[PDB]
């Protein structure tokens, strides 16, 4: 039975790689086709827009060529090329992309449930079954991406949107990269960086598994495991090899997290002979029906409220520029 399940994963990934490669090797609209509505998020912006012809709403990522000045540029090409070639239930869909004299634009499906980040900070923490439901989707998404030699490199609740079924949509592929062995760019978000990134070591997809450990801890605790006011203090905590857990964490959860938040790459789950199955077959996931999650048959822990098309009530406000 587990043998049948493993053969079926092999089959699915072989077909997924064939489809990805067709689009990867052979990868529009214009700005006046959309009414800009509201900024949904911003960083070093994404706007809700409304397509004038069809009335459909989208999330438009706008990249200022005057800001993307850092050697930033490769990462932007990675993002567009990867998003146009992947296809998975928990990855945001890219619809259009175009550019003008000032900006690059990627137009994606609008996911109106808001960021996991908002919901988590509002309620404080998620119970373990609630956290597990989200974590299972990330596990499957990384099994898919890594099989295509893609590393994601920016997992955190800010980048996980909740859709109308209560499932996750992974957004922001700005640091995602196709990597056949190791890569060397120092990039990511401080609380979620693996030790080998901070230590300026060439690294591989195991940094995404470390970051899953940070995410599961933060979802279940309400704060991440390496927590300080300044990035340099965070980095010292990450490289030490020490993690402490809330007293309400189950022992199964602590065991899984000790194996993800493992500084020694010869021991870190996701990075061993059995690959992702050390994670999928861990006791903390014993209740998880992996195929039922993929097929979206599992009832979600909560469904965000929506008042209609173009509703932005589940997002925070930002200064409009």
């Amino acid at each position: 039975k587990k043998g049948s399940e493993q053969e079926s994963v092999k089959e699915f990934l072989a077909k997924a790689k064939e489809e990805f490669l067709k689009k990867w090797e052979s990868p529009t609209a214009q700005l006046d086709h959309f009414d800009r509505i509201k900024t949904l998020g911003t960083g070093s912006r994404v706007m809700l827009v409304k397509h004038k012809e069809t009335g459909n709403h989208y999330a438009m990522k706008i990249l200022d060529k005057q800001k993307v000045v850092k050697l930033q540029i490769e990462h932007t090409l990675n993002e567009k090329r990867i998003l146009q070639a992947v296809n998975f239930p928990f990855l945001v869909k890219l619809e259009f992309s175009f550019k003008d004299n000032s900006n690059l634009y990627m137009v994606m499906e609008y996911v109106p449930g808001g960021e996991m980040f908002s919901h988590l900070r509002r309620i404080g923490r998620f119970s373990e079954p609630h956290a597990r439901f989200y974590a299972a989707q990330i596990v499957l998404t990384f099994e898919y991406l890594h099989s295509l030699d893609l590393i994601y490199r920016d997992l955190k609740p800010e980048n996980l949107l909740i859709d109308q079924q209560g499932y996750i949509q992974v957004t922001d592929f700005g640091f995602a990269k196709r990597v056949k062995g190791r890569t060397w760019t120092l990039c990511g978000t401080p609380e979620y960086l693996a030790p080998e990134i901070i230590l300026s070591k060439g690294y591989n997809k195991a940094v995404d598994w470390w970051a899953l450990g940070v995410l599961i801890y933060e979802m279940a605790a309400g704060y991440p495991p390496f927590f300080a006011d300044q990035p340099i203090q965070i980095y010292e905590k990450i490289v030490s090899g020490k993690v402490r857990f809330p007293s309400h964490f189950s022992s199964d959860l602590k065991d899984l997290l000790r194996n993800l938040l493992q500084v020694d790459l010869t021991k870190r789950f996701g990075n061993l002979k059995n690959g992702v199955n050390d994670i999928k077959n861990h006791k903390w996931f014993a209740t998880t029906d992996w195929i039922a999650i993929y097929q979206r048959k599992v009832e979600a822990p909560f469904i965000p409220k929506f008042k209609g098309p173009g509703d932005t009530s589940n997002f925070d406000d930002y200064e409009e520029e």
Binding site: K156, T189, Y223
Partner: peptide, 12 residues
């Protein structure tokens, strides 16, 4: 620790 949204870092 930092409780608001966290910015990614693109180089060192």
């Amino acid at each position: 620790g930092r409780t608001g949204r966290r910015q990614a870092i693109h180089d060192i």
